[model samples]
Target: SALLLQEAQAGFCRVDGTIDNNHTGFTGSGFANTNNAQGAAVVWAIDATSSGRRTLTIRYANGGTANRNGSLVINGGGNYTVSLPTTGAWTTWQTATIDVDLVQGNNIVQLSATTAEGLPNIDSLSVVGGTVRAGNCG
Candidate 1:
């Protein structure tokens, strides 16, 4: 199943600029608005039924002509910077797959932009080849 940006963990764990429903890059009603601000991030807490490596797929789109970059930080694991490629238009969406290790219990995952260039509009996240326990684990 897809973990929508709007469904991410609440509280200070998810500190971002805003949410944009105006953009066509989103799948649901809205997407996380980083406002192109570096360091702005959105966090999610997930529970893995079985511990191991899993494929984490992120769906995003960059309306700008320039490409964007961001980092994915897994708690107790590390960070992996990802290049968010442009999808030609805001209405167009794309996916980036990355291998991430997950614990059997609750895990924290955070996504943030690396530079001042900021990040692309995030649609949703899906974790394949892993057993997910809950939709909102946090």
Candidate 2:
């Protein structure tokens, strides 16, 4: 089975804005950062019942016309860049899937911006083959 973890349920160690629910189609509230800084990041902790390769489906929305770039780090591992295309509007949501290696038990997943354009509005993160729980930047 798969686990659907909301953005509001996860941990946002760094970032400027609070959870915003103004938009629709988002699970709970979406993480919004208008700072447009590469240092900002949203981290999610995953508790895998089994250790193996897993595909993470990230839900987000970019109202801007330009595409946004960010990086994903699993278990504090190397950075994997993620390209977020424009969704036309903030209310319009999208999903991006990426496969990564995961270990048994606790694993860390973080999404950090790679450019000054910052990241798109993150809605939720879903993982196939394991469970996704709350996480922190430690």
Candidate 3:
């Protein structure tokens, strides 16, 4: 289970989110592979209606699972874009900062598993904006 933080700080905040680890790698409901599993579920809420577009930084733990591989996805009711790191180890916590465009309302950010099994663990998710403090900066 993933417990979200009270709020977003330092250019980021928490949103209403949940993690679903059902049928991860069969191209089905949730985003996941076969052997890997995200030990816990997590989500982050970010308001990107300030500077039009911005970048978000995310970090995660490898947990104690085998193939803890995953990707970061941003969706805005249209097309979804995902950022995957090709070169990374399963034993070490990894982080990837992605640049995404925000819309008028809200955007959905997802942490998807990218393996045949399931991911082992998840740490935290956050987003950044153009105005640091002036534009929805936490």
Please tell me which predicted candidate would have the highest lDDT against the true structure.
2
**How accurate locally, in lDDT, is each candidate?**
0.71, 0.75, 0.40
TM-score for all predictions?
A: 0.83, 0.84, 0.47
lDDT for residue 90 in candidate 2, whole number 0-100: 90
TM-score of candidate 3 relative to the true fold: 0.47
**10 residues in a row with least lDDT, candidate 1:** 3-12
Model 1 clashing-pair count: 0
* Model 3 bad stretches (over 4 Å): 1-41, 63-67, 76-92, 131-138
Better of 1 and 2 by lDDT: 2
Model 2 gets an lDDT of: 0.75
**Per-candidate count of clashing residue pairs (backbone under 3 Å):** 0, 0, 22
Per-residue alpha-carbon lDDT of model 3 for 54-128, expressed as tens digits?
655444434343544455554523333333443244344455666667664445555555554344333444445
Better of 2 and 3 by TM-score: 2
lDDT of 1 at 50: 79
lDDT value, residue 78 of candidate 1: 66
lDDT of 1 by residue, 1-138 (tens): 433334433322454776677866476656666856787776777777878887878888788888788889877356787788888888888988898888887778888888676788777777765566443434
